[PDB]
Ligand binder design. Structure first.
Ligand SMILES: COC1=C(OC)C(=O)C(C/C=C(/C)CC/C=C(/C)CC/C=C(/C)CC/C=C(\C)CC/C=C(\C)CC/C=C(\C)CC/C=C(/C)CC/C=C(/C)CC/C=C(/C)CCC=C(C)C)=C(C)C1=O
Ligand SMILES: COC1=C(OC)C(=O)C(C/C=C(\C)CC/C=C(\C)CC/C=C(/C)CC/C=C(/C)CC/C=C(/C)CC/C=C(\C)CC/C=C(\C)CC/C=C(/C)CC/C=C(/C)CCC=C(C)C)=C(C)C1=O
Ligand SMILES: CCCCCCCCCCCCCCCCC[C@@H](O)O[C@H](CO[C@H](O)CCCCCCCCCCCCCCC)COP(=O)(O)OCC[N+](C)(C)C
Ligand SMILES: CCCCCCCCCCCCCCCCC[C@@H](O)O[C@H](CO[C@H](O)CCCCCCCCCCCCCCC)COP(=O)(O)OCC[N+](C)(C)C
Ligand SMILES: CCCCCCCC/C=C\CCCCCCCC(=O)OC[C@H](COP(=O)(O)OCCN)OC(=O)CCCCCCC/C=C\CCCCCCCC
Ligand SMILES: NC(=O)C1=CN([C@@H]2O[C@H](COP(=O)(O)OP(=O)(O)OC[C@H]3O[C@@H](n4cnc5c(N)ncnc54)[C@H](OP(=O)(O)O)[C@@H]3O)[C@@H](O)[C@H]2O)C=CC1
Ligand code: SF4
Ligand code: SF4
Ligand code: SF4
Ligand SMILES: [Zn+2]
Lengths: 176, 342, 208, 96, 63, 156, 144, 386, 115
């Protein structure tokens, strides 16, 4: 089923012809457009007062990456390398070895924030909730080198943002 | 050889050349070319800057990620010099000002600062030190520039015995003061030349040649205590050189003789300005002085470099000074100037 | 079988098979093979010389009015003697159907350009030449479309490396952008993901 | 539990530290070195040992679906404690 | 119609490959050996062509 | 002293003037530019910060490289960068402009716009949110505020 | 209808602590609105809400004038909100930390840090892996 | 000799990175030669180098204005090759978010076109609505525009508990915004002078040149892939197809406005008819298991491991699947060889054919007419260059 | 036999004729290119560069390959005439920023493991 959009003809009675002539000579529709703009002038603008106000987000928001820990303080990451294998941009680089106490842990966990596409596949692939995409998005840097995260930077990010990351996961883990 | 300093790769941008260089005065005319040539090979460059960091922005794309490190320094502070050369295995000194300023006289720029750099580099264990002086550097020279150059060269040799010293002569390039300076004289409308420039001989050298000479001196083991003279292939009279400069720029040439005292007086008048002077008595002395000949010193040809003639790389500098009418004129339609060669 | 399996449609399969037989009977000089895939898609494998006739027929015959050229692309299979496989996808609005035409070529054999049959091919063929190196004989204006000016090689080729051969950077000494041999800070890491166990027994090939 | 190299540089939990003659330390001049001070090995070391009256115990890291995959640990060996592969927690059977 | 060329096939000039990677490379044509960790033989069916290994080094930043 | 105070005050005034009125060039390449558009949308309204788009490079202060920089496009980006009168600033937006991003290993993509032009601020994301780019612009304003040209000239 | 608006304006003027406070908030936040004080930060930020306003303008923060080490009367930025108030302020939840405090962990930072780019505290990347190939050390005893 | 001018890449009306070389006599246009490839990133080779899941993110990027529709087209192709079928709730979610994406694309297309014509105000008014729809995207997926929500087995996550109500709240008010746009644009005589009888293309030429979507419907051709070849649940919703009569820019603008209204109608129907159930195909060998089962079940852990490391294999075969994306017929020709990585992935974007036909479309017109014709074709260069 | 079909030229002679036509066209165009692109090279440099590029593949004995090479040469010439190329594209023929790789055994041995 279909409809026409420009298949109407105007009536040619003298009243309608005179109305069309009045529209042409007196610019009625131009005045209507001016009135619409004037009506928009007297409304409340939709502008927020950044940085003192922020746009809404959701618990599923993907921001800066972080590495989490268990409540005991042990790192969750076990160097299964699933995030590295699933990364569409090849932004994760992982090297691992047995720890002094025999645990299976990483010695290198690098993320290139300039290769990363912030897709969140890494936190989907992780089986222990080790790597997450946090809520932070205001982490602009003045140099390229500052966006090449090593393991220490990601662990510091986790320590810094855990209080909110845990709450965000608690609010959404039932959908996963 | 400190394994982390073993060369690797094909010599490209991401390759490692095993060179750690501290380039003093890298924010000038020669410094940008030296930094570019260092960054081409994958060398690590430490740029000590005293200016606004904005003024160093053009050096950022010259190296790979993390291969160029910018640090702030002070010429009169020895601790900053120690900080910036503590990890470098080669130190290049390109510090120099063509005019005297209220805080840094020629002695400060050409004697004290190079001596301090050499002393701190020797104390820090720097293997190689490249120093730049002038070809006309003489202790009896009528120019304070060249006397200071000679004194500072002697001090650097005394403080760093294995220092390579390079003496170029009136480098010309896109950002040079030498080619542009002559071209800039057209605004006045008359080219004042002492004795019509008929008793001054010049041997200018290309900037890329000087940068390649510095780079090849860094990688040459038998250039430790040597002194090099970097000069061009051809010698020109000043009159013919300025004639060729104005011919390439397609500007009317109106040269007139000016007595030495009058040129000195004019130079002094320009010198008074708070901002950098268009010309100075020192510049007048240096630009009307014949280039010395030193057949006993090695040159570019001893470092594997064939000096680029002025006639090949002069249009790339002077095309900017042409008007719209001649902006598209080719390179080989100027009938190059006569060379007084031997 | 019901909830997760895609349901079959036998009527469309029969219609497509009958029409493929019809087309093959009408043009025996060029048609080499006809197939109907199990998701009801009709493919006709022809000889390279029949690109202009077959398409013209499929565009003009009353029983087969494929007035729309949806796509035209090539596939690179190095192990075949005729390397490139040219694919035309046609859509019939009158009969609400789609058909596919396939042919083959090598690096040096040209293929007749179908700009007279379809105007849409004008750019598509150019793209093929840009990325596969297949030359189209009577193309009114054939040149690179997607690659850079003075770009050597054809990237959409199996032997062409992923990162190419040259990379660009601004050089201050010459005051322009220059091209230099490619040198990656981190090499692309090759993954061997193929399982050593057969997945689909229905596609097993005879061991000769 | 961070240490300090002879050059005064902090040692990371992976143990990495630049040599005395390594030039790459110049990248930390006028800047700092990023080091995480909460070493995981010491943190998991201070956790006590859980005593359970079974030959086989199960661990999932705590939190159910928010932990690691649930694994079973055999505690039949007497001179040793069962250690979780994921969490690192230790379990033992009562003795003495 | 038919020119009957009597030359050996050679497309080296049309492929855009630098001569360094044509005269110096050495390709290897083989059926890959079975991964001894597994028993499946499905990866030993087709022939493969690869190139000789070249230098890999450690990039100064991030290693 | 007296001259030090005068140069400090003049430098602060010039820095404020350059900081309050930033005129980015209308220049977008890919997905990220859509987010750039959303900054000009009523919700964020970059105009209220003094940031107004202008078309000609000669009347522009800041380049925002929003999108992938291919090999075919690099000469044009460099050219329109060279035609911006100084002082000029470059803001790199998104993974594609930062380091190549999702197309880092492609044969036709420059791995970062910092190989062609010097960059002042790197904004991460794919794409960065309009708030992320707003934060980047405010960081650029702070960086401009920190700069000291007349003080450095006076101590020369 | 008009005198009421002017009275609302004068009430806003008086509700910030007089003319000096009104001028301070006008020149610092470019907004002179008054709302209910939801909470106060550890670092001095004050978090207000006003549900009568439309979504996006019903929650705001007045930043502190002095963070860890830098003066912040003029140069404020959005990276100074700590994670709990970050979650509340971005409308990720309906509850402030003053009502639903975050879980306490020993490893969590006790002192939030803002963005340290361009400062001597910026992050510098480096390789965290030990040396790969160990070289041979020649003996120190002469061989003849 | 005609004057030669470069239109784009750094131009306000170049619509991104398009270099157009035009030969002008005065301001008459003698010939347009579009130069593309300034946003060609070699997407198809990279897709050849990724798994079927890893290649999904690339699809949103091809057309960054209507990202969800692109993933759906790709998902349909992979599902057809896999011989599986998404659950009903997944299909209804897909169609709902496809209609929302169509709204986004139309708002962007109409407003930018007006902006090029010089009408600045409409763009500002509708980008607040675009921001709200971005909020919907971010709530459902976590990213404002590059959701990657629609997967080749269904969708990734179920909707949050308060999303349908907010979608209803937005939809019940969008009509007045459309009406304000039409008040400012439809009957204005300057707009009609700028758009009427500009870029007229006949039905036969439009068919032969490979045009699709509105560029067909504006010439009177009754064709729409959601009506003739429906894919997800489009046979269970009712809507009208706007048909033009003149083939000029004005008819296409009217068609796009009416398409926005009809998509509001479809959104209402989808909101009323959303069924319960699961969101991805209940086949753990294609779609990953739930996180709760991956941590308790051995089979679930094995399948999660093998899906996120190697990926699912796709039986060998070739397909061409096309959907009615907001800009026209968007298609993918996917070739699989039995591996977990696609052998070939050719992407057909209607912008390719439309930009190819631009030269025929701008015969006998002015420079500003050429700007209008570029605006009316709804061109995005990510999908053109790929 | 071999059932091969030509592109343009039936034999070697026609291919050589087309090659000479392309050479004449490039030789004519070089000075205009030098003027329009404001290159810093001389006309002689451009012409001998054209000669070198022509001689780089002078070993081809297949008429089809010669025809394809001539087609690509026409494409490049048309790109240069219409000023679709820029100064960088033209100067990419000269490799002005590349260090000269050594060709002898000893230098290659000194430099690295690459033969
Ligand atoms: C590359 O470096 C250089 C510069 O930097 C760009 C210079 O400005 C510079 C000096 C050049 C000046 C800018 C001169 C331009 C202005 C002149 C004073 C010409 C004006 C002369 C009169 C005012 C003519 C008016 C009528 C008179 C009778 C009075 C030189 C030499 C230089 O070399
Ligand atoms: C979907 O596909 C795609 C597209 O498809 C559409 C694209 O398009 C596309 C490209 C898109 C990007 C390039 C982003 C483009 C963003 C949008 C297209 C538009 C967003 C913003 C627009 C420009 C709208 C602008 C319209 C508004 C009205 C803004 C206001 C306009 C202004 C210019 C008007 C005011 C002008 C300025 C304020 C400058 C005026 C200031 C003065 C000149 C200075 C004051 C004058 C002085 C000299 C006074 C001096 C006198 C003194 C005495 C005063 C006192 C001094 C003493 C010291 C006291 C991409 C990438 C794409 O993918
Ligand atoms: C030709 C006649 C005119 C002559 C020149 C005078 C021109 C008029 C001067 C205008 C003065 C206003 C400039 C600064 C206004 C104060 C605003 C204040 O906030 O600035 C702070 C600091 O500003 C500077 O310190 C003051 C600059 C002015 C210094 C005095 C200059 C006096 C003029 C002298 C001219 C001639 C000198 C005599 C020799 C000839 C930093 O602000 P900032 O953090 O960014 O913005 C906060 C953003 N928030 C709100 C979102 C949080
Ligand atoms: C004959 C009468 C003719 C009158 C013509 C009609 C009216 C013309 C007046 C135009 C009005 C201009 C707008 C004034 C708005 C007031 C803004 C003020 O409240 O902000 C102050 C701005 O203060 C400025 O000093 C006032 C500048 C206003 C005058 C500039 C107008 C240009 C015309 C004359 C220029 C001469 C400027 C001389 C003073 C610098 C805050 O800045 P400041 O206190 O600093 O704080 C930063 C320094 N701290 C950090 C140390 C605290
Ligand atoms: C109609 C409304 C607008 C009116 C127009 C005039 C407005 C005047 C406003 C005056 C504000 C003060 C201007 C100061 C900025 C001058 C430009 C500038 O920044 O130059 C920087 C420059 C840096 O050079 P270097 O560091 O040595 O070189 C490094 C690179 N090789 O510093 C200087 O040399 C400038 C020193 C002071 C300049 C004189 C300013 C004094 C005020 C004059 C105002 C005249 C108005 C009439
Ligand atoms: N140019 C020529 O014609 C030839 C020059 N050579 C010599 O080679 C050296 C460099 O040449 P060139 O590049 O042309 O000169 P430049 O003026 O272009 O470079 C000067 C460099 O030295 C720095 N510098 C100058 N003075 C000081 C100071 N007091 N304290 C700290 N740094 C300072 C400058 O820093 P900043 O810019 O930040 O102030 C700048 O980085 C000079 O010593 C010169 O004498 C000698 C023969 C002629
Ligand atoms: S978000 Fe995506 S691109 Fe970024 S690291 Fe994770 S998997 Fe890789
Ligand atoms: S972050 Fe998670 S997925 Fe990645 S290696 Fe560690 S445990 Fe495995
Ligand atoms: S960074 Fe991401 S969003 Fe931005 S242009 Fe690149 S692919 Fe598009
Ligand atoms: Zn455990």
């Amino acid at each position: 089923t279909y409809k026409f959009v420009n298949m109407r003809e105007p009536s040619m009675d003298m009243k309608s012809v005179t109305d069309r002539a009045a529209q042409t000579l007196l610019w009625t529709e131009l005045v209507r457009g001016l009135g619409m703009t004037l009506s928009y002038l007297f409304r409340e603008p939709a502008t927020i007062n950044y940085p003192f106000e922020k746009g809404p987000l959701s618990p599923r928001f993907r921001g800066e990456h972080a590495l989490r820990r268990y409540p005991s303080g042990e790192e969750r990451c076990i160097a299964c390398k699933l995030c590295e294998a699933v990364c569409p941009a090849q932004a994760i680089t992982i090297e691992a070895e047995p720890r002094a106490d025999g645990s299976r842990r990483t010695t290198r966990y690098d993320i290139d924030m300039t290769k990363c596409i912030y897709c969140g596949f890494c936190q989907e692939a992780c089986p222990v909730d080790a790597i997450v995409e946090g809520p932070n998005f205001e982490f602009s840097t003045e140099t390229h080198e500052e966006l090449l995260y090593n393991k220490e930077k990601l662990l510091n990010n986790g320590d810094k943002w855990e209080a909110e990351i845990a709450a965000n996961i608690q609010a959404d883990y039932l959908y996963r | 050889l400190h394994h982390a300093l073993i060369p690797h790769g094909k010599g490209g941008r991401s390759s490692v050349s095993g060179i750690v260089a501290t380039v003093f005065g890298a924010t000038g005319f020669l410094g940008r070319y030296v930094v570019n040539h260092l960054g081409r090979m994958g060398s690590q460059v430490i740029v000590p800057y005293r200016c606004e960091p904005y003024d160093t922005m053009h050096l950022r794309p010259m190296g790979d990620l993390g291969q160029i490190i910018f640090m702030e320094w002070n010429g009169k502070d020895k601790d900053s010099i120690r900080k910036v050369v503590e990890h470098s295995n080669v130190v290049i000194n390109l510090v120099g000002r063509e005019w005297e300023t209220k805080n840094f006289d020629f002695e400060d720029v050409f004697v004290k600062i190079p001596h301090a750099i050499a002393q701190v580099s020797k104390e820090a264990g720097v293997e190689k030190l490249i120093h730049i002086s002038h070809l006309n550097a003489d202790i009896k020279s009528p120019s304070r520039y060249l006397r200071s150059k000679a004194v500072g060269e002697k001090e650097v040799r005394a403080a760093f015995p294995e220092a390579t010293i390079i003496k170029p002569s009136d480098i010309f390039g896109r950002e040079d003061r030498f080619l542009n300076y002559f071209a800039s004289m057209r605004w006045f409308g008359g080219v004042p030349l002492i004795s019509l420039g008929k008793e001054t001989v010049k041997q200018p050298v290309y900037i890329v040649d000087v940068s390649k000479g510095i780079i090849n001196a860094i990688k040459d083991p038998d250039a430790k205590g040597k002194t090099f003279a970097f000069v061009g292939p051809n010698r020109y009279l000043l009159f013919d050189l300025v004639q060729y400069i104005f011919a390439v720029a397609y500007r009317p040439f109106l040269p007139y003789p000016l007595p030495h005292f009058a040129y000195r007086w004019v130079g002094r008048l320009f010198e008074v300005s708070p901002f950098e002077p268009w010309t100075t008595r020192d510049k007048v002395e240096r630009v009307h002085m014949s280039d010395m000949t030193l057949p006993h010193l090695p040159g570019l040809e001893d470092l594997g470099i064939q000096a680029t003639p002025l006639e090949l790389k002069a249009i790339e500098v002077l095309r900017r000074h042409r008007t719209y009418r001649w902006l598209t004129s080719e390179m080989e339609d100027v009938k190059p100037a006569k060379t007084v060669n031997i | 079988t019901r909830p997760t399996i895609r349901p079959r449609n036998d009527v469309v399969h029969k219609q497509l098979s009958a029409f493929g037989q019809y087309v093959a009977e009408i043009l025996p000089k060029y048609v080499q093979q006809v197939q109907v895939s199990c998701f009801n898609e009709l493919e006709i494998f022809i000889h390279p010389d029949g690109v202009i006739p077959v398409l013209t027929f499929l565009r003009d015959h009353t029983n087969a009015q494929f007035k729309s050229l949806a796509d035209l692309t090539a596939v690179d299979v190095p192990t075949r003697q005729n390397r490139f496989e040219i694919v035309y996808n046609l859509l019939s609005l009158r009969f609400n159907s789609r058909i596919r035409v396939k042919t083959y070529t090598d690096e040096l054999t040209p293929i007749e350009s179908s700009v007279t049959v379809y105007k849409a091919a004008n750019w598509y063929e150019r793209e093929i030449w840009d990325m596969f190196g297949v030359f189209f004989a009577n193309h009114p204006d054939l040149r690179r479309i997607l690659t850079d000016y003075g770009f050597e090689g054809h990237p959409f080729r199996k032997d062409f490396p992923l990162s190419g051969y040259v990379e660009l950077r601004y050089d201050d000494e010459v005051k322009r952008v220059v091209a230099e041999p490619v040198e990656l800070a981190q090499e692309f890491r090759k993954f061997d993901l193929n399982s050593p166990w057969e997945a689909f027994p229905a596609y097993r090939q005879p061991p000769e | 539990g961070v240490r300090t190299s002879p050059t005064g540089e902090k040692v990371t939990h992976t143990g990495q530290a630049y040599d005395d003659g390594d030039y790459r330390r110049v990248r930390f001049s006028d800047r700092q070195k990023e080091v995480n001070e909460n070493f995981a090995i010491d943190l998991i070391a201070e956790q006590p040992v859980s005593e359970v009256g079974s030959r086989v115990i199960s661990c999932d890291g705590g939190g159910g679906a928010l932990g690691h995959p649930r694994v079973y640990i055999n505690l039949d060996k007497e001179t040793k404690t069962g250690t979780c592969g994921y969490c690192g927690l230790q379990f033992r059977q009562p003795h003495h | 119609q038919l020119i009957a060329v009597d030359e050996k096939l050679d497309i080296t000039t049309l492929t855009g490959v630098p001569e360094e990677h044509i005269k110096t490379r050495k390709v290897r044509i083989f059926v890959p050996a079975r991964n001894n960790m597994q028993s499946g033989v499905n990866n030993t069916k087709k022939w493969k062509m690869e190139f000789d290994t070249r230098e890999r080094w450690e990039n100064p930043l991030m290693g | 002293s007296r001259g030090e105070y005068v140069v400090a005050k003049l430098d602060d005034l010039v820095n404020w003037a350059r900081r309050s009125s930033l005129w980015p060039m209308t220049f977008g390449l890919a997905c990220c530019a859509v987010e750039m558009m959303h900054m000009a949308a009523p919700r964020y309204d970059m105009d209220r910060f003094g940031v107004v788009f202008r078309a000609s490079p000669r009347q522009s202060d800041v380049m925002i490289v929003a999108g992938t920089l291919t090999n075919k496009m690099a000469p044009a980006l460099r050219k329109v960068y060279d035609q911006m009168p100084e002082p000029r600033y470059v803001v790199s937006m998104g993974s594609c402009a930062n380091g190549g991003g999702y197309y880092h290993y492609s044969y036709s993509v420059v791995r970062g716009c910092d190989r062609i032009v010097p960059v002042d601020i790197y904004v991460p994301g794919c794409p960065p949110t309009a708030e992320a780019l707003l934060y980047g612009i405010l960081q650029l304003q702070r960086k401009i505020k920190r700069e000291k040209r007349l003080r450095i000239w006076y101590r020369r | 209808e008009l005198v009421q608006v002017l009275r609302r304006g004068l009430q806003q003027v008086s509700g910030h602590g007089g003319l000096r406070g009104y001028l301070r908030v006008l020149f610092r936040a470019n907004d002179v609105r008054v709302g209910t004080l939801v909470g106060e930060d550890k670092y001095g930020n004050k978090y207000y809400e006003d549900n009568k306003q439309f979504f996006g303008r019903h929650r705001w923060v007045i930043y502190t004038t002095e963070m860890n080490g830098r003066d912040t009367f003029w140069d404020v930025d959005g990276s100074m909100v700590p994670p709990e108030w970050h979650r509340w302020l971005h409308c990720m939840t309906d509850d402030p930390p003053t009502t639903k405090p975050p879980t306490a962990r020993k490893y969590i930072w006790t002192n939030h840090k803002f963005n340290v780019s361009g400062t001597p505290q910026q992050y510098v990347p480096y390789s965290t892996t030990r040396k790969k190939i160990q070289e041979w050390v020649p003996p120190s005893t002469p061989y003849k | 000799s005609n004057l030669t001018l470069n239109f784009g890449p750094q131009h306000p009306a170049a619509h991104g990175v398009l270099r157009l070389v035009m030969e002008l006599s005065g301001e008459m246009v003698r010939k347009c030669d579009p130069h593309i490839g300034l946003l060609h990133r070699g997407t198809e080779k990279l897709i050849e180098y990724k798994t079927y899941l890893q290649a999904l993110p690339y699809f949103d990027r091809l057309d960054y204005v209507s990202m969800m529709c692109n993933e759906q087209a790709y998902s349909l192709a992979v599902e057809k090759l896999l011989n599986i079928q998404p659950p009903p709730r997944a299909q209804w979610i897909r169609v709902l978010f496809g209609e929302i994406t169509r709204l986004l694309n139309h708002i962007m297309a109409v407003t930018t076109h007006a902006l090029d014509i010089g009408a600045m105000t409409p763009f500002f008014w509708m980008f607040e609505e675009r921001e709200k729809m971005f909020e919907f995207y971010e709530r459902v997926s976590g990213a404002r525009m590059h959701a990657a929500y629609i997967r080749p087995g269904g969708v990734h996550q179920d909707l949050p508990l308060g999303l349908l109500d907010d979608i209803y709240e937005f939809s019940k008010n969008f009509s007045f915004r459309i009406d304000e746009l039409e008040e400012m644009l439809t009957n204005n005589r300057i707009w009609r002078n700028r758009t009427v009888d500009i870029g007229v293309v006949t039905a036969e030429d439009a068919l032969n040149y490979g045009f699709s979507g509105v560029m067909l419907r504006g010439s009177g051709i009754q064709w729409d892939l959601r009506k003739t070849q429906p894919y997800d649940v489009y046979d269970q919703v009712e809507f009208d197809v706007p048909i033009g009569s003149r083939g000029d820019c004005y008819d296409r603008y009217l068609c796009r406005v009416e398409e926005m209204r009809q998509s509001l109608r479809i959104i209402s129907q989808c909101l009323n008819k959303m069924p319960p159930g699961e969101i991805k195909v209940d086949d753990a060998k294609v779609s990953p298991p739930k996180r709760a089962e991956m941590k308790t079940s051995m089979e679930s852990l094995i399948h999660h491991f093998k899906l996120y490391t190697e990926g699912y294999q796709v039986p060998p075969g070739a397909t061409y699947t096309a959907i009615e994306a907001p800009k026209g017929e968007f298609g993918v020709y996917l070739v699989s060889d039995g591996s977990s990585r696609p052998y070939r992935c050719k992407i057909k974007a209607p912008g390719f054919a439309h930009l190819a036909g631009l030269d025929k479309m701008s015969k006998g017109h002015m420079l500003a007419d050429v700007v209008a014709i570029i605006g009316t074709q709804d061109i995005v260069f990510g999908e053109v260059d790929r | 036999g071999t059932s091969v079909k030509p592109i343009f030229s039936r034999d070697m002679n026609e291919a050589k004729r087309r090659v000479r036509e392309l050479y004449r066209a490039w030789y004519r165009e070089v000075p205009n290119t030098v003027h329009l692109f404001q290159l810093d090279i001389s006309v002689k440099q451009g012409r001998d560069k054209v000669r070198e590029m022509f001689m780089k593949n002078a070993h081809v004995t297949d008429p089809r390959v010669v025809d394809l090479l001539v087609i690509k040469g026409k494409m490049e010439l048309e790109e240069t005439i219409n000023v679709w190329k820029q100064r960088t594209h033209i100067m990419r023929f000269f490799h002005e920023t590349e260090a000269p790789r050594p060709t002898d055994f000893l230098s290659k041995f000194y430099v690295g493991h690459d033969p």
